[PDB]
């Protein structure tokens, strides 16, 4: 997260860290046995780390569970990153409490101007790598479809939305991919892609979760 602030240990109880010996992506806990992340964060050998704050020190509240299966959306296109969503079932259910809790899925999509909370352990520099140990937060608005399309012409599908600051300086970045974009208490986006980080006129692009709600529910139901 570039230009964000420290969230405070456990103030974002649905945030998860995807680990394969190091932190590589974020995710969102939607129920005690399922997490939603981005399809491009897929890989085998994933350990989900819940109740985390400082990813390099065990401090208490952490729960490490291995993933049972990972279900990448069947129409995921790695070239366009359209349908960039993936579900991970956990080997055992997590114990939910105030420090580890799920986030709700939306009932409607959000509109431009809605303010959302984006968090993660991603890079905090737009030029060079500087990953933090603790969870960072950024409040950002959903932009209008026209501003999104003017910024990424020919690259935005109806399953994506832009959120951020066209002036640059504040944005999500590498390490943040797969994590949550929560607006009014509902999971509306998944950190997907962007051109660099916190660059002027190049906002973050997120998977539009409201278009996958029926799929998430059907898929969890049949697995
Ligand atoms: N808001 C942005 N401008 C942005 C920048 C990103 N940069 C990345 C990114 C860059 C290199 C590698 C990965 C990556 C993905 C999966 C596993 C490991 C690295 C990234 O997510 N994701 C990004 C996601 C966003 Cl939304
Ligand atoms: Ca820790």
Swiss-Prot record:
The active site is at residues 40, 84, 177. GO terms for biological process: digestion; proteolysis. It is an enzyme of class 3 (hydrolase). Keywords: Calcium, Digestion, Disulfide bond, Hydrolase, Metal-binding, Protease, Secreted, Serine protease, Signal, Zymogen. GO terms for cellular component: extracellular space; serine protease inhibitor complex. Disulfide bonds join 7-137, 25-41, 109-210, 116-183, 148-162, 173-197. One of its GO terms (molecular function) is serine-type endopeptidase activity. Ca(2+) binds at residues 52, 54, 57, 62. PANTHER family: RIKEN CDNA 2210010C04 GENE, TRYPSIN-RELATED. Interacts with SERPINA1. Belongs to the peptidase S1 family. This is Serine protease 1.
């Amino acid at each position: 997260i570039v230009g964000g602030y420290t969230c405070g240990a456990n103030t974002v109880p649905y945030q998860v860290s995807l680990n394969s010996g190091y932190h590589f992506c974020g995710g969102s806990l939607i129920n005690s046995q399922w997490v939603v992340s981005a399809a491009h964060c897929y890989k085998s050998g994933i350990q989900v780390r819940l109740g985390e704050d400082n990813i390099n020190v065990v401090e208490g509240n952490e729960q490490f569970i291995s993933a049972s299966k990972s279900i990448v959306h069947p129409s995921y296109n790695s070239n366009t990153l359209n349908n960039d969503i993936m579900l991970i079932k956990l080997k055992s259910a997590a114990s939910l409490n105030s420090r580890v809790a799920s986030i709700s899925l939306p009932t409607s999509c959000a509109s431009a101007g809605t303010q959302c909370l984006i968090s993660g352990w991603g890079n905090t520099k737009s030029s060079g790598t500087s990953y933090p140990d603790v969870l960072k937060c950024l409040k950002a608005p959903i932009l209008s479809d026209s501003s999104c399309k003017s910024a990424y012409p020919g690259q935005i599908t109806s399953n994506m939305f832009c959120a951020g600051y066209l002036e640059g300086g504040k944005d999500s970045c590498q390490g943040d991919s797969g994590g949550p974009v929560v607006c009014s208490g509902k999971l509306q986006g998944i950190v997907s892609w962007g051109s660099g980080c916190a660059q002027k006129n190049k906002p973050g692009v997120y998977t539009k979760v409201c278009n996958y709600v029926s799929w998430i529910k059907q898929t969890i139901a049949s697995n």
